[PDB]
Design a binder for this molecule. Sequence first.
Ligand SMILES: [Cl-]
Lengths: 89, 76
Amino acid sequence: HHEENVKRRTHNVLERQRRNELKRSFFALRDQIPELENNEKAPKVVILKKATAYILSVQAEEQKLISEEDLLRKRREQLKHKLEQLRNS
Amino acid sequence: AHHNALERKRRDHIKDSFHSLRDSVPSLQGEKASRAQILDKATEYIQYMRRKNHTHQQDIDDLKRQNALLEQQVRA
Ligand SMILES: [Cl-]
């Protein structure tokens, strides 16, 4: 029974260390989500779900910015072409 | 019984949410990942994407300045 006691206490320490590491990982993710930053009562499920939603939002934002830049680049080429036509007339 | 039912639903909702998050992260899409790996790779991805959108906006601001200048040279 002493071996079972030593094993139980050893596993208890290891499990606490793993829980603490996991908590730090949750908090680092939480802190990338502006709505949750430094909220020490943010539940795990809320961090996970808000992270997924935030990823979708940042990806949609990227697509919006890519579209804006594409139109600006097409416009730049059109302007450069107009300037070249004008200067060579 | 009611309390065990609440607890199992709680655990299942966390499992579902880990899967959804993992499936949202390109570096993990299609791979085997522990809970710690999913969290850490999602953190890195969000940090990267937030900065990347700043890089895109900088390029957009550079291009808007470039096109205004070209419009001024066409007007002249
Ligand atoms: Cl967990």
